[PDB]
């Protein structure tokens, strides 16, 4: 009854920054197995009718886990895009600026804050209920979907299935190629939310 | 100054359930990460001069992380062995069929535990302070260490940077490896201590 969306993007669309190959396990056995897995969860439970983010609002447990990875990744890929990246324009480009003084000190702060968030885990810019712009660090599944008021922005998949494949190690080099394939457009979406 | 602890056996030792590549990575640069990071946060500390179990048992937040997981990995390879694996015999077979009921048993319900701890972590067989042998979960850099009177016997290491190289997302098919590799004349010593 929950569906693995389609990426909105072509598997060798982020080429050379992430490959087919990434896109493959993780879109296709990683975020697939969440859908499963909830999908499997939710029969005979008060869940069932229930859309995927009520539920990651009232879960606690393994629902939440599969329900709010599900949403994350979506999120994710979203965040990503082929012919994007660099420096952001608009009303994003301002409220980053109005927030952290410019890009180029956003980028380190974030970059920063991504490279030490321990273990399996999510960096995200957020727009909080006052409406100035955070950085926040999410460990696992949580999300700030469930902190009332809060609209996420971006975030980056910290999880080390998102660039084992392509950077080994080294989320230093995984964090160049998030820069490259940063999606301006999904983020001044969800500014506007 | 701590050092990266050399490995136990030679890096194609584990082949081919373990690649050598993994073992490159794994102890070459993660746990050697763990090291540097360690040596970097105690100069001027409380934690300047004491052993690295007095540390683990003793701190908290990224000098807890870091020590955590040197001592982690140091004995998670003490645990893998060449020509090792299948079931236990003497001492640790018979605690195992006291506490588990059987090999068989005591198996699926590792692996059962492993399988499904959530994110990075780690999963334990370990001996509780009256004797008794447990099954017990931790998550990131935590450890039975730290807690009073218990000595781990046994560990599978569940961040993906130690079965991503070989077997990508499926963790049922990395316990099927560790199985074949479990160093029992270590868990043996273990459960002396
Ligand atoms: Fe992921
Ligand atoms: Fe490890």
Same sequence: chains 1, 2.
Wanted: glycine share 8%; proline share 5%.
């Amino acid at each position: 009854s929950f569906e693995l969306p389609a990426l909105p993007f072509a598997k060798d669309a982020l080429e050379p920054h992430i490959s087919a190959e990434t896109l493959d396990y993780h879109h296709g056995k990683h975020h697939n197995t969440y859908v499963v897995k909830l999908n499997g969860l939710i029969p005979g439970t008060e869940f069932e009718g229930k859309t995927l983010e009520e539920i990651i609002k009232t879960s606690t447990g393994g629902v939440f886990n599969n329900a709010a990875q599900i949403w994350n990744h979506t999120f994710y890929w979203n965040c990503l895009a082929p012919n994007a990246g660099g420096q952001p324009t608009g009303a994003v480009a301002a409220a980053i600026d109005a927030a952290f003084g410019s890009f180029e000190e956003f980028k380190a702060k974030f970059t920063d804050s991504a490279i030490n968030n321990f273990g399996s885990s999510w960096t995200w810019l957020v727009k909080n209920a006052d409406g100035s712009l955070a950085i926040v660090n999410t460990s696992n599944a949580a999300t700030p979907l469930t902190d009332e008021g809060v609209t996420p922005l971006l975030t980056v998949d910290l999880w080390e299935h998102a660039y084992y494949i392509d950077f080994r190690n080294v989320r230093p080099d995984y964090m160049g190629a998030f820069w490259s394939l940063v999606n301006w457009s999904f983020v001044e979406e969800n500014l506007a939310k």
